[PDB]
């Protein structure tokens, strides 16, 4: 039994024609106090997976160490560690999902909501969610916390079902994600203006964007 202390808010994501996009702000809240501002909540695993984490930051840092150790362990006695036997997004997710459900079953959870975004070896987009309860689900768009309530509706206007994915470009997809982040800054009392964004494409690979800001805001009607 826990209570979360230092926390991170929404993580948002979606699929597009060639890959997936994921984003999360750089804030570590301490209750109502906006305590830490240099917190990276997107953690890449290899060159084909990004894990976005919300909730307790001490538990997030623990999960970082686990993923770091997983890469090390996979390389052991593995000549194809950077080829056919490299860590897939599906492998990384299932591992985390196992851990999350085991910890909830021992009544000592990792107080987090997690989204694993990546591209598989065959080119297929991977996007799946898991949280402190061990609950898992997948969707063309996925978001945690406030993102679930405010980002998902906006992202679903772009990709409402499976057939909308081939019709959605990386330009259109990123535009929707960046817009959603602005809306969250307007309306979430534990969001920050600064955020990170990651694109995992089947052709261009992993692009990690740091120190992004929310811009073009409307206030003058005040």
């Amino acid at each position: 039994t826990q209570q979360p202390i230092v926390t991170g808010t929404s993580v948002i994501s979606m699929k597009y024609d060639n890959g997936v996009i994921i984003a999360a702000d750089n804030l570590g809240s301490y209750g109502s106090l906006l305590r830490f501002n240099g917190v990276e909540r997107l953690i890449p695993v290899g060159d084909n997976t990004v894990v976005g984490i919300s909730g307790d930051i001490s538990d997030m840092q623990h999960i970082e160490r686990l993923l770091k150790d997983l890469v090390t362990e996979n390389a052991y006695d593995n000549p194809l560690a950077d080829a056919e036997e490299a860590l897939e997004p599906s492998y990384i997710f299932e591992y985390l999902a196992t851990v999350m459900y085991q910890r909830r079953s021992k009544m000592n959870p990792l107080w987090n909501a997690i989204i694993v975004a990546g591209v598989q070896s065959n080119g297929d987009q991977f996007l799946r969610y898991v949280n402190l309860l061990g609950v898992t689900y997948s969707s063309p768009t996925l978001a945690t916390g406030f993102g679930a309530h405010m980002a998902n509706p906006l992202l679903r206007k772009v990709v409402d079902r499976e057939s909308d994915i081939p019709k959605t470009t990386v330009q259109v997809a990123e535009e929707a994600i960046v817009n959603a982040m602005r809306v969250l800054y307007y309306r979430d009392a534990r969001s920050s203006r600064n955020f990170s964004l990651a694109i995992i494409d089947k052709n261009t690979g992993l692009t990690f964007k740091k120190n992004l800001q929310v811009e073009n805001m409307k206030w003058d009607f005040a």
Partner: protein, 222 residues
């Protein structure tokens, strides 16, 4: 419930969904959440259904008597003042959450009221369980100097976000347009995007299927 209100050029428009629930069960698939306080002042209500209907009727009644007493068309701020003082007096026990809008000799107005008796002003507002889904759309697409047709589109789009993404909201979209110098235009079932598909089978029973013990003619006359 999902309700919104949006200001435009020469007036104000409000909208709402048409789903009524008791727990997870849908009681009414086409209930009317748009209420009339006076001919050109209309109310959208979420929360405890009986409270929103009763409080809108009581103030509507007193507004009519006031209009007759003063030989003047009723103002939105009068309805706002009466509603908020009534709700405050009951310390939130009357669970009425309202978006009040209308036109009067002073101009066009848009307010919200919360159950404890707090009021606020805005060019765009949203209340109810689907307010976050609606507000996400409003924050994304709203601008200064909207036309009538643009405001109706924005309002109904905000309600649709609630219909699709919020489980508390569903079915149809009701709209009411209050323009300065014109009659208020109530648009019942302005949109109907949730029509029930044809059933696979008719469940009309052969006559005599039900076993009967007694028959008797009932006297309704004097």
């Amino acid at each position: 419930t999902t309700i919104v209100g949006v200001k435009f050029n020469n007036g104000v428009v409000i909208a709402a969904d048409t789903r009524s629930t008791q727990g997870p069960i849908v009681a009414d698939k086409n209930c009317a959440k748009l209420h009339r306080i006076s001919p050109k002042i209309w109310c959208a209500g979420a929360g405890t259904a009986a409270d929103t209907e009763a409080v809108t009727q009581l103030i509507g009644s007193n507004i009519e008597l006031h209009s007759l007493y003063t030989s003047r068309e009723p103002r939105v701020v009068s309805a706002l003042q009466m509603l908020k003082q009534h709700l405050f007096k009951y310390q939130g026990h009357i669970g009425a959450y309202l978006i009040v809008a209308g036109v009067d000799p002073t101009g066009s107005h848009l307010f919200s009221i919360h159950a404890h008796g707090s009021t606020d002003v805005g060019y765009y507002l949203s209340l109810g369980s689907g307010s976050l889904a609606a507000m996400a759309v409003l924050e994304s697409h709203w601008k200064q100097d909207l036309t009538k047709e643009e405001a109706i589109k924005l309002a109904s789009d905000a309600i649709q976000a609630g219909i699709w993404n919020d489980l508390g909201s569903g079915s149809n979209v009701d709209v009411c347009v209050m323009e300065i110098g014109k009659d208020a235009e109530y648009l019942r079932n302005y949109l109907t995007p949730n029509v029930r598909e044809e059933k696979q089978k008719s469940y009309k029973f052969p006559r005599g299927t039900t076993a009967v013990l007694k028959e008797s003619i009932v006297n309704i006359c004097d």
